[PDB]
Amino acid sequence: VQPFAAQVASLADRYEESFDIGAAVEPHQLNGRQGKVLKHHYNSIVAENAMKPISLQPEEGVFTWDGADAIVEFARKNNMNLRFHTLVWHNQVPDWFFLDEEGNPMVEETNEAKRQANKELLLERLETHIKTVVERYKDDVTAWDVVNEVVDDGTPNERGLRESVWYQITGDEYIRVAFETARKYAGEDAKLFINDYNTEVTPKRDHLYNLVQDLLADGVPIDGVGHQAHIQIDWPTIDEIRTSMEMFAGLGLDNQVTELDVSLYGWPPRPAFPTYDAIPQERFQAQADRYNQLFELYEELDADLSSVTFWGIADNHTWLDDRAREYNDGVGKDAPFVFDPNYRVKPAFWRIID
Ligand SMILES: [Mg+2]
Ligand code: NA
Fold it and tell me: Annotated catalytic residue: which of 259, 282, 299, 300?
């Protein structure tokens, strides 16, 4: 039996010369055993869900602040940094954004002049959402995910930009307006990030590189790249990870790891073990070696890496379980973190605290 998390060395303190150590949280986790683990080990937090656009402005002019406020309060009380996830995304985003003045979807519009008016209305709505949110949280947030997942996994257009509703209505303009709006209301010292998954592999990596180069050339304020790092044991390679961070550091950008989890599976995650108990020791060992190499790379790169956030605290709460159940008939368990479902350490803990 492994010791409890509160009996081992703080991860945040272990990494205090290199980068923050963060966790994605929900408001209900900010007391009890999670509360304790958080305070002991972490010096940054992010909202898993409560600061996404639909969580903050579910109807126009109607702001729901309480979950988000509770997260901010917890960070302040415990002297934690706070990442804002996220100003702009194509999911968990309210439908009302994308409806024209008569209530019909803007994407359906064929008259070029009405389309231009729709583009301007959506951009103005985006600006209002950003202005309102940034005004409330500008003195708490230490890193903004200003846009999330705006780059495509393939190449549907020459710039590799995701053809979401934002793109269909505004082209790339939503991205420019989101950064400029955030800079304007948060101030010059605010740290603005473009966040995405699979930043280590091509062609996405290069499309993202080209996008940030382009926007920097136009004076669009971007401070860094957020690497979600939803990764596996063998993929991507350490070198793929390294190369991606070095490329962005080459443009004068900061890197953060924002949503780290190390799945026990491939993609899709099948076959998956049905219970935590069913997972063999070998999975935890191979994960531990993987985590060792990750954190050695993060330390080597620490001039260009300011924060490493995990997408959860302990293995009792992870969205990888939703994915395992989805691809295995509603039955499956992943185990991505250094802390097990009882808040005891896992073999990976030892390999990143040393
Ligand atoms: Mg180590
Ligand atoms: Na650093």
Answer: 259
Q: For residues 354 and 350, what is the distance between their CA atoms, to the nearest angstrom?
A: 6
Give the closest ligand to the alpha carbon of residue 304.
Answer: 2
| Separation between Cα atoms, residue 174 and residue 125, nearest integer Å | 11
> Interior CA angle at 123 toward 122 and 124, to 5°?
90
**CATH class of the structural domain 1-354:** alpha beta
292 is in an annotated binding site: yes
Tell me, yes or no, if 259 is annotated catalytic.
Answer: yes
How many other CB atoms are there within 10 angstroms of residue 140's CB atom? 16
- How far does residue 303's CA lie from ligand 2's centre (Å)? 5
**Distance from the CA of 292 to the center of ligand 1, in angstroms?**
4
What is the dihedral angle through the alpha carbons of 84, 55, 23, 302, rounded to the nearest 10 degrees?
-20
| Residue 161 annotated in ligand binding | no
Tokens of 276: 């935590």
> Would you call 27 helix, strand, or coil by DSSP?
helix
Q: What was the structure determination method?
A: X-ray
**Resolution reached, in Å?**
2.3
| Euclidean distance between CA atoms 270 and 254, whole angstroms | 35
Q: Which residues place a Cβ less than 5 A from the ion ligand 1? A: 292, 351, 354
Residue 108: HSE in the Cβ half-sphere, 13 Å Cα cutoff: 8
Q: For residue 302, say whether it is annotated as part of any ligand binding site.
A: yes
Between CA 140 and CA 76 the distance in angstroms is 8
Q: Which ligand gives the minimal distance to the CA of 21?
A: 2
From the list 5, 18, 33, the residue with the least C-alpha distance to 302 is: 18
CA of 300, nearest ligand number:
2
Q: Are 259 and 230 in contact (CB under 8 A)?
A: yes
